[PDB]
C-alpha cells in the first residue's frame, strides 16, 4: 500500500512485474472478530460488487480474504507496471484452474472486471501511433477467439469485455483483419458442424492465427452455439456498413479474391455466402438518387470486382515471359492520342503491376498521380478514383507517400489554374451591345473538383482516429489553398454563381477539421478561422445574378448551403483563444453578419428555385425554420445598430459596403450612410456601374455646394 | 413483341401484351433463352437513361443497341415514370418464372452477361440493367446439395466463385496473345496429370478452356484432350472442375453442342468398357463361420463418388 522510505514501495513494482502467477489437491488443505470485520469492510469497499457477491464474501474467514487481497494487489501492480503485450489476457489463466472452480469465484470475475476497466482507462489516452492500433487489433482478435469457450461464464464475460471494448473504440469496426478472422472462425465452426462426433480429436486450428477451438459432443449443443454466433457477425457488419460503407465494401471486395477459397466455393463455404449476403440489405443510394422527396444501387460492386480480377489476371500473365518502360510508353501514347479505352486499360494495368511487387518504385507512383491532370474530365477522374481505392485497399504501408503525391498534384493544379481556380471572363453589357459581339453566358465548368472534395472528405473521415500525420497534410493542403485578400479581383477562387458548390463544400470541410479538436496549438486555429471568414466574405463583393444550370445540380447546392449555415451557427466555442474579450466580440460581429448574408442568399436561391408554392417539392424543414426565425429576429432592428453594421462593412472592405444596398434592406439609413462615407473619401472606389450614383447627385434639385467633385477619372459607363 | 410493348398509343400495348402472354404460354422454353434477357435488359437501360433527358430538348427517339429498332417517349415526366414503373414488373415476373424451373442455365447466362467491357466503364453510374441482374438473383435462389433433403441454408458462394474464376482465367489467357501455343498447354496438362497435383490440374484446365472459348476454329485435339482429362484423375474434385469448365464452354460459345456431346458420350462409353467405376468387378469376402485363418473378414464396399 502506498504511504517509510519511498524506495521501499518502489522496489515492489519490479518484483510484482517479474513475479509468477499465484496458482496451485484441495485448496483448503494447502492453506479476534474485529480485525476480520475491518478486513471485510476494506475488501468490500475496494471491490464494491453486487450484493450477492458481498453476501458470499460475508461468510469467508481471514485466510481467504487475505489471499484475495494479495492477488488483487499483485494483479493491479502487474497491469499498472507491465511492458509485455499480453497484459490483460493473463487473467484467464486463473479461470482455467480446476481447484478454484471446485471450491465453494465471483470475486475473481469482479477483480477481473476492475483490472479490465483500469487497463481500458490506461489505453484510452496512450498515443495515436500504429503500434497502439496493432495492440488493439490483437486484443480484439483474442476476445473474438475466446467467445466460444466450452464453459458457461467464460463466454459471458468475454462477450461483456468485447462489447465494452468495441463501445469505447468504434474505429475497430472497419478494420481489415477482424473481418477475415471472424469469417475464418465461422467457416471453421460450420465445417466442424458435421464431423463424425464419435470420432475423436475435437480440436481445430484457425488458419493464419495460432489458436485452437474445442467443440461439444452432442449435435444439438454445436448447432445452438453456431446459431448463437451467427448473429454477432450480422450485427457488427451492419454497424460497420452504417457509418463508412466505402472502406468496408472495398475490404469485402478484396476478401473475395483469394485462390484458396475458389476451389472450395463449389461447396458450402459459409464465409463467402455470408459475405455475399450481408452486402445488399445494408446498401445505400448513389449520387443520382441521394437527394429526392418521396433506386438501390449495386452495379458499382460488380463492376469494380470484375475489373479488378480481369486486370489482375492480365498483369499476372506477363511475368511468365524491363517491363515498366513498356507500360510508361503505352500510357504516354494513350495520353497523346487521347483515347479513353486505352487510357483506362493502361491505368488499370499499371496499378495492377504496382500492387504485386516488392518495392515502391517511385517513378510508377509519380506517373500514376500525374496521369489524370493531362486528361481533365469526369471519366478519367472516375478511373483514377477507382485505381486509387484499389491501391489503398491492396497494399499496406503506402498511405503516406501516396498522400504526399496527391497533395503535390493538388497544389500543382491550384497553381496552374486548370479548374475552379481559373481566371474570370467578362461579357459585354446589353445596354451598349449593338456591335457584332452579342452577349452570351460564359460560365466556368468544374466537374471533377466536385468529386475530388468528396474523396478528400471520405479519406479525412477514415483517418481522423487512426493516423496522426495525415492531419498535418490536410491542414497544409487547406492552408495553401486560401488567402485573405478580399477585394476587387484577387481571391484565388472564381466568383461565378455556377461555382458555389465546391467552394462551400471545402469551407464546410475546413470547419469540420477545426471542430474535430485535433490541433493542440492555440494559434493555428486563429489563423485558420481568420482565413475561413475572409474567404467566406469574399464571395459577396460582386453584383448579384442568377444561376444558369438546369433544374438538376441545383438542389444539392441549396442543401450544401443550408448545411454550411447550420455548421456556422454552431460555432460557439470561444473565450479560450489564448485580452480575450476583444477577439471574442471581433469574431461575434462577423459571425452575425455572415449569418445574415447567408440567410438572405439562401432565401433568394430557394425563391428562384420554384416560382409557385409547389407543395410537392420540399427540402430540410429544420434549416428552413431556423432561417425564417433568424430573418424574423433580424428584420426588427431599429435605425441604430445598423449604421454601425455599415461602418463595420466599410472597415472590412469598401467593395462590400458598396454592394451592401444591392442586397435589399427595407430601410433608407443604409443609403444615407453609404453616401456620407463615399463623400468622406471618394478615392477608395473606382467601380463605375454602381458607385457613381452615390456621389454624382450631391443634391437632387437643390444645386448647391460645388466642391470636392472630381468625376474626371471614373471609368466610362452605359450611354 | 417485346420491343412493341412500349408503344405510344393505348390499345397497341394492350394487344401486344396479350399476344406476348399467349406466345409465352404456348411455348414455355423461350423463358431460358440467351437473347431475350439481353434485349430486355438493354431496353430497360435505354428507358432508364431516357427518364431524365431534358424533355424540352427535341429528338425523343432512341436506338436499341445490337437490334435495329427505335423507341419513342412521351413529353411529361409523369407519363415516362409511369411507363417505366409499369415495365419494371414484367422483368421480375419472367425472371422468377425462369429461375423457378431451370436455375442452372439462367444463372449461367446471367453470369455470362456480367462479363462485358462496355458496361464496366459505366458501372460507376446507375446502369439499371446490372442492378436488376444482381438484385434478381438472390430471392429466387435455392438450396445446395448438402441442405436439399431435411425436415424442419441459402447458398450463393457458387455464383461468386464461378464468376471470379471465369474473369481471372479469361484475363490470364487473354494476356498470352500479346507475346504455337497449344503445345505448351497440352504439355502442362500432361505434366500436371503425371505429377498428380490438383492446383496445377485446375489451373491448366481453366487456362485450356479459356483459350478454346476465344478462337475461330474448333481445334478438335483441344476438345478431345478436354474430354479425356478427368478420366486420368478419377475423383470428386477433378470432376467438379470438369463440370464447371463444361458449363462455361456451353454457355460461352455457340454451335458446339453436338461435337461436345459426342465426345462426352465416347468418354462415358470408354469408362463403362474399362470398368473404372460403378461397372467394376465384384469382390468376395470370407464367411465368418470358417474364418479362423489370418484372413479376418472385413467389409469391402465399392466407392462411386
Amino acid at each position: 500500500v502506498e504511504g517509510w522510505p519511498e524506495e521501499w514501495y518502489e522496489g515492489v513494482c519490479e518484483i510484482a512485474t517479474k513475479s509468477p502467477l499465484l496458482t496451485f489437491e484441495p485448496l483448503r488443505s494447502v492453506l479476534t472478530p474485529a480485525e476480520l470485520s475491518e478486513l471485510r469492510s476494506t475488501i468490500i469497499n475496494l471491490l464494491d460488487p453486487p450484493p450477492e457477491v458481498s453476501a458470499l464474501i460475508n461468510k469467508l474467514d481471514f485466510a481467504m480474504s487475505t489471499y484475495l487481497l494479495s492477488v488483487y494487489r499483485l494483479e493491479y501492480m502487474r497491469v499498472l507496471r507491465s511492458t509485455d503485450p499480453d497484459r490483460f489476457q493473463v487473467m484467464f489463466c486463473y479461470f482455467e484452474d480446476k481447484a478454484i472452480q471446485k471450491d465453494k469465484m465471483q470475486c475473481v470475475i469482479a477483480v477481473a472486471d476492475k483490472v479490465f476497466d483500469a487497463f481500458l482507462n490506461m489505453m484510452a489516452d496512450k498515443a495515436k501511433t500504429k503500434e497502439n492500433e496493432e495492440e488493439l487489433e490483437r486484443h480484439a482478435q483474442f476476445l473474438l477467439v475466446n467467445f466460444n469457450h466450452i464453459h458457461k461464464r467464460i463466454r459471458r464475460v468475454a462477450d461483456k469485455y468485447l462489447s465494452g471494448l468495441v463501445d469505447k473504440f468504434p474505429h475497430l469496426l472497419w478494420s481489415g483483419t477482424v473481418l477475415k478472422t471472424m469469417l475464418d472462425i465461422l467457416q471453421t465452426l460450420s465445417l466442424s458442424l458435421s464431423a463424425d462426433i464419435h470420432k475423436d480429436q475435437p480440436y481445430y486450428d484457425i488458419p493464419d492465427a495460432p489458436y485452437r477451438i474445442t467443440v461439444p459432443d452432442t449435435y444439438e449443443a454445436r448447432e445452438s452455439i453456431v446459431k448463437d454466433f451467427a448473429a454477432r457477425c450480422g450485427m457488427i457488419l451492419q454497424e460497420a456498413m452504417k457509418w463508412a460503407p466505402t472502406v468496408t465494401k472495398s475490404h469485402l471486395q478484396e476478401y473475395l479474391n483469394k485462390h484458396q477459397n475458389w476451389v472450395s466455393g463449389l461447396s458450402q463455404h459459409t464465409g463467402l455466402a455470408m459475405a455475399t449476403e450481408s452486402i445488399l440489405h445494408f446498401a445505400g443510394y448513389n449520387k443520382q438518387n441521394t437527394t429526392l422527396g418521396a433506386k438501390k444501387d449495386y452495379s458499382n460492386f460488380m463492376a469494380s470486382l470484375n475489373l479488378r480480377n480481369r486486370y489482375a489476371g492480365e498483369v499476372y500473365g506477363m511475368i511468365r515471359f524491363d517491363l515498366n518502360k513498356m507500360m510508361v510508353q503505352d500510357l504516354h501514347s494513350a495520353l497523346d492520342r487521347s483515347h479513353p479505352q486505352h487510357y483506362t486499360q493502361a491505368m488499370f494495368k499499371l496499378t495492377a503491376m504496382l500492387i504485386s511487387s516488392k518495392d515502391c518504385d517511385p517513378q510508377l507512383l509519380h506517373h500514376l498521380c500525374w496521369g489524370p491532370l493531362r486528361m481533365f474530365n469526369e471519366h478519367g477522374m472516375e478511373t483514377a478514383l477507382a485505381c486509387w481505392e484499389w491501391l489503398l485497399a491492396g497494399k499496406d504501408g503506402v498511405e503516406v507517400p501516396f498522400m504526399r503525391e496527391m497533395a503535390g498534384a493538388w497544389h500543382m493544379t491550384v497553381e496552374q489554374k486548370f479548374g475552379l481556380f481559373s481566371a474570370e471572363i467578362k461579357e459585354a453589357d446589353p445596354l451598349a451591345a449593338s456591335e457584332a459581339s452579342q452577349p452570351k453566358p460564359c460560365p466556368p465548368e468544374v466537374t471533377p473538383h466536385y468529386i475530388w472534395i468528396d474523396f478528400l472528405v471520405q479519406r479525412f473521415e477514415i483517418a481522423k482516429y487512426c493516423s496522426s500525420d495525415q492531419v498535418e497534410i490536410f491542414s497544409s493542403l487547406l492552408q495553401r489553398s486560401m488567402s485573405l485578400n478580399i477585394g476587387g479581383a484577387k481571391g484565388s477562387m472564381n466568383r461565378h454563381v455556377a461555382a458555389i458548390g465546391p467552394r462551400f463544400k471545402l469551407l464546410t470541410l475546413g470547419l469540420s477539421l477545426l471542430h474535430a479538436d485535433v490541433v493542440p496549438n492555440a494559434t493555428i486555429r486563429n489563423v485558420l478561422r481568420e482565413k475561413i471568414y475572409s474567404t467566406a466574405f469574399d464571395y459577396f463583393s460582386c453584383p448579384p445574378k442568377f444561376p444558369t444550370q438546369g433544374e438538376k445540380r441545383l438542389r444539392e447546392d441549396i442543401s450544401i448551403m443550408i448545411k454550411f449555415w447550420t455548421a456556422m451557427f454552431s460555432d460557439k466555442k470561444y473565450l479560450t483563444a489564448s485580452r480575450g474579450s476583444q477577439l471574442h466580440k471581433y469574431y461575434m460581429k462577423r459571425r452575425t453578419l455572415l449569418l445574415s448574408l447567408l440567410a438572405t442568399e439562401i432565401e433568394r436561391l430557394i425563391t428562384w428555385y420554384n416560382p409557385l408554392s409547389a407543395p410537392e417539392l420540399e427540402l430540410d424543414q429544420a434549416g428552413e425554420n431556423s432561417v425564417a426565425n433568424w430573418r424574423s429576429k433580424y428584420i426588427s432592428l431599429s435605425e441604430k445598430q445598423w449604421k454601425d453594421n455599415v461602418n463595420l462593412a466599410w472597415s472590412i472592405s469598401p467593395y462590400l459596403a458598396v454592394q451592401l444596398p444591392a442586397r435589399f434592406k427595407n430601410t433608407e439609413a443604409i443609403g444615407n450612410e453609404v453616401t456620407r462615407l463615399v463623400r468622406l473619401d471618394p478615392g477608395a472606389v473606382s467601380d463605375v456601374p454602381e458607385a457613381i450614383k452615390f456621389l454624382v447627385t450631391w443634391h437632387t434639385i437643390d444645386a448647391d455646394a460645388p466642391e470636392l467633385s472630381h468625376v474626371l477619372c471614373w471609368a466610362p459607363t452605359d450611354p
Side-chain angles (χ1 to χ4, degrees), chain A:
Chain A
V1 58
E2 169 81 324
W4 299 94
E6 174 269 316
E7 56 274 15
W8 285 14
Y9 169 78
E10 185 62 31
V12 193
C13 304
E14 52 274 31
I15 301 299
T17 305
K18 289 300 181 60
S19 297
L21 299 180
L22 297 181
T23 61
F24 301 95
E25 52 277 358
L27 177 58
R28 180 55 189 85
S29 61
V30 179
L31 291 80
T32 58
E35 52 86 73
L36 183 61
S37 176
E38 66 88 10
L39 286 181
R40 290 178 180 180
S41 63
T42 53
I43 292 182
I44 209 66
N45 294 329
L46 261 297
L47 270 301
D48 300 327
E52 45 270 74
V53 183
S54 66
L56 182 69
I57 295 301
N58 288 135
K59 54 91 182 178
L60 298 181
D61 60 324
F62 78 104
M64 305 308 114
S65 64
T66 183
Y67 171 81
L68 265 54
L69 183 56
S70 60
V71 66
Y72 156 77
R73 292 292 186 176
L74 174 61
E75 297 303 329
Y76 197 90
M77 295 292 296
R78 179 102 59 84
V79 75
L80 186 55
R81 311 301 291 269
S82 179
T83 180
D84 211 88
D86 62 2
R87 283 171 293 270
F88 96 102
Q89 47 270 60
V90 298
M91 204 59 62
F92 290 84
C93 297
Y94 291 160
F95 292 149
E96 299 184 1
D97 196 328
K98 299 298 181 60
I100 305 301
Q101 297 175 355
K102 294 301 179 300
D103 188 11
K104 295 297 182 178
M105 179 58 178
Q106 284 72 6
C107 49
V108 189
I109 67 179
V111 66
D113 287 1
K114 295 297 299 301
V115 65
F116 178 81
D117 172 71
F119 156 78
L120 195 57
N121 199 329
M122 180 275 311
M123 190 118 293
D125 61 328
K126 181 57 181 300
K128 297 185 61 59
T129 181
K130 187 68 60 181
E131 317 303 325
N132 301 20
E133 181 189 13
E134 301 292 340
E135 301 298 81
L136 292 180
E137 193 80 359
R138 192 180 301 101
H139 292 5
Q141 204 165 6
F142 176 83
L143 289 186
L144 282 181
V145 79
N146 271 21
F147 184 80
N148 301 333
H149 196 265
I150 194 180
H151 206 260
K152 294 294 300 300
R153 303 173 180 176
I154 304 303
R155 35 185 172 183
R156 302 191 302 101
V157 65
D159 189 12
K160 179 175 59 181
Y161 286 161
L162 173 61
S163 62
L165 180 63
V166 76
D167 186 15
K168 200 173 181 60
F169 289 86
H171 77 270
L172 302 178
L173 292 175
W174 52 72
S175 182
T177 313
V178 169
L179 310 180
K180 304 178 181 180
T181 298
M182 70 166 320
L183 293 180
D184 293 358
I185 65 180
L186 176 61
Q187 177 186 354
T188 299
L189 294 184
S190 62
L191 185 142
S192 175
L193 173 63
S194 302
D196 190 10
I197 56 162
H198 282 93
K199 200 268 305 175
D200 58 331
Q201 301 297 145
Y203 304 91
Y204 290 91
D205 297 330
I206 294 92
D208 305 71
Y211 289 106
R212 55 174 59 258
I213 292 299
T214 60
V215 298
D217 51 0
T218 62
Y219 283 112
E220 283 69 18
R222 200 167 304 179
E223 294 182 359
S224 178
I225 186 59
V226 67
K227 180 170 296 183
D228 200 329
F229 187 83
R232 301 286 299 184
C233 181
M235 193 275 294
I236 65 177
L237 276 181
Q238 72 88 10
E239 284 291 339
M241 187 148 295
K242 175 184 178 181
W243 285 15
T246 303
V247 50
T248 174
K249 187 173 303 179
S250 187
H251 287 177
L252 291 183
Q253 292 181 5
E254 185 68 25
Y255 176 84
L256 300 179
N257 294 331
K258 294 194 298 179
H259 308 161
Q260 301 82 338
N261 305 125
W262 291 348
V263 182
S264 181
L266 306 181
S267 299
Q268 269 286 354
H269 195 50
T270 313
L272 251 55
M274 157 69 65
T276 188
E277 188 270 349
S278 174
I279 185 64
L280 320 134
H281 34 74
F282 312 133
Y285 304 144
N286 71 292
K287 312 175 185 300
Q288 299 188 8
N289 302 334
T290 185
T291 53
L292 281 88
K295 197 176 182 180
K296 292 187 176 182
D297 316 292
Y298 331 104
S299 179
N300 181 25
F301 197 99
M302 318 326 291
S304 178
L305 189 61
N306 295 333
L307 286 170
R308 187 164 302 179
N309 286 339
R310 174 63 180 260
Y311 283 100
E314 185 177 2
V315 78
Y316 166 76
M318 294 302 98
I319 311 298
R320 301 284 78 182
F321 297 157
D322 189 71
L323 294 180
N324 319 88
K325 312 301 297 180
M326 177 192 300
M327 307 285 96
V328 174
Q329 186 66 23
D330 294 0
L331 176 60
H332 284 179
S333 178
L335 287 181
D336 296 331
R337 201 184 63 181
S338 68
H339 197 284
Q341 209 74 13
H342 288 58
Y343 168 80
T344 54
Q345 291 182 1
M347 202 68 176
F348 271 98
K349 192 171 303 178
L350 170 62
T351 183
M353 214 293 303
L354 178 57
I355 199 182
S356 63
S357 179
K358 310 302 177 301
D359 53 75
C360 298
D361 223 4
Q363 55 277 17
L364 293 189
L365 193 61
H366 171 267
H367 284 62
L368 190 91
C369 290
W370 279 17
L373 270 62
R374 302 170 189 173
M375 200 181 177
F376 230 77
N377 67 91
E378 71 291 344
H379 162 256
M381 222 56 186
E382 289 287 326
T383 303
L385 289 183
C387 292
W388 296 355
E389 183 60 35
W390 183 16
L391 173 61
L392 283 180
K395 195 173 300 179
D396 58 331
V398 81
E399 293 78 4
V400 181
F402 177 84
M403 213 60 60
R404 188 181 297 102
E405 293 289 342
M406 188 212 61
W410 173 272
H411 186 274
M412 185 271 206
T413 301
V414 165
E415 192 67 283
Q416 282 191 345
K417 306 180 181 61
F418 260 73
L420 172 57
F421 308 86
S422 62
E424 188 174 358
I425 303 179
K426 62 181 301 300
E427 62 282 351
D429 41 4
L431 289 182
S434 300
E435 209 262 357
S437 61
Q438 298 87 20
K440 54 181 180 59
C442 300
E445 175 264 352
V446 268
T447 303
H449 282 56
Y450 217 82
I451 322 178
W452 203 346
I453 306 298
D454 300 1
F455 179 83
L456 295 184
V457 168
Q458 291 285 158
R459 187 48 53 183
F460 172 78
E461 291 295 335
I462 291 305
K464 183 171 59 180
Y465 306 100
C466 171
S467 298
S468 177
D469 298 0
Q470 311 183 21
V471 180
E472 310 299 328
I473 304 298
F474 284 154
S475 177
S476 180
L477 181 142
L478 294 188
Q479 188 271 352
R480 298 186 72 181
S481 178
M482 291 160 50
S483 57
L484 51 150
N485 280 329
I486 166 179
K490 39 187 64 59
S492 69
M493 304 189 73
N494 198 327
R495 299 177 299 181
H496 196 266
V497 163
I500 57 180
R503 186 190 193 99
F504 286 110
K505 185 177 292 297
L506 190 61
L507 268 284
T508 300
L509 177 58
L511 278 182
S512 177
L513 169 61
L514 181 58
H515 277 343
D517 191 8
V518 186
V519 279
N521 202 328
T523 182
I524 310 298
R525 307 188 300 268
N526 178 27
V527 178
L528 192 57
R529 188 185 312 273
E530 206 79 10
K531 287 190 174 185
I532 287 294
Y533 282 169
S534 183
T535 190
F537 270 99
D538 179 73
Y539 171 79
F540 295 96
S541 179
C542 297
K545 46 185 60 180
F546 295 89
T548 64
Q549 55 276 20
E551 196 280 335
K552 203 57 64 181
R553 284 288 309 275
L554 184 60
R555 188 186 185 99
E556 83 292 344
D557 294 352
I558 305 180
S559 303
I560 291 178
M561 292 208 62
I562 293 177
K563 191 171 303 179
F564 177 78
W565 187 93
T566 300
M568 179 61 64
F569 173 73
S570 177
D571 200 73
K572 294 193 300 179
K573 300 179 178 181
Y574 298 170
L575 302 179
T576 54
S578 295
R579 195 93 297 177
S581 178
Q582 299 175 359
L583 291 81
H584 176 253
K585 192 165 300 180
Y586 172 90
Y587 285 157
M588 293 309 288
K589 299 182 178 301
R590 301 189 176 185
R591 172 182 178 267
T592 303
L593 189 57
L594 221 174
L595 285 176
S596 298
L597 293 183
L598 279 184
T600 298
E601 181 64 26
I602 291 181
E603 199 282 332
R604 179 175 178 266
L605 284 180
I606 189 55
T607 300
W608 170 265
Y609 185 24
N610 56 274
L612 296 84
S613 61
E616 189 273 344
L617 298 171
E618 191 64 26
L619 300 180
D620 184 15
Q621 183 65 25
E624 298 170 358
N625 296 13
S626 301
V627 168
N629 296 330
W630 185 263
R631 289 192 299 101
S632 179
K633 181 258 181 179
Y634 105 98
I635 205 179
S636 60
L637 296 182
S638 61
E639 57 92 3
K640 284 301 299 300
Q641 83 254 9
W642 214 343
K643 306 172 61 179
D644 185 72
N645 297 20
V646 179
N647 298 331
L648 181 140
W650 181 263
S651 300
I652 297 301
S653 179
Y655 299 89
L656 185 63
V658 172
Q659 286 286 347
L660 184 60
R663 313 294 179 177
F664 175 78
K665 311 299 177 62
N666 189 19
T667 315
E668 289 73 14
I670 287 87
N672 301 127
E673 189 62 26
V674 168
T675 301
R676 168 181 170 268
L677 285 182
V678 72
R679 182 183 299 181
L680 254 295
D681 186 12
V685 287
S686 295
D687 48 328
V688 287
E690 312 99 291
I692 183 179
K693 61 191 56 56
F694 295 153
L695 174 61
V696 53
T697 157
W698 74 104
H699 286 88
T700 299
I701 203 60
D702 300 335
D704 202 75
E707 87 294 329
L708 67 87
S709 183
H710 51 69
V711 301
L712 305 178
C713 300
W714 294 68
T717 173
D718 282 310

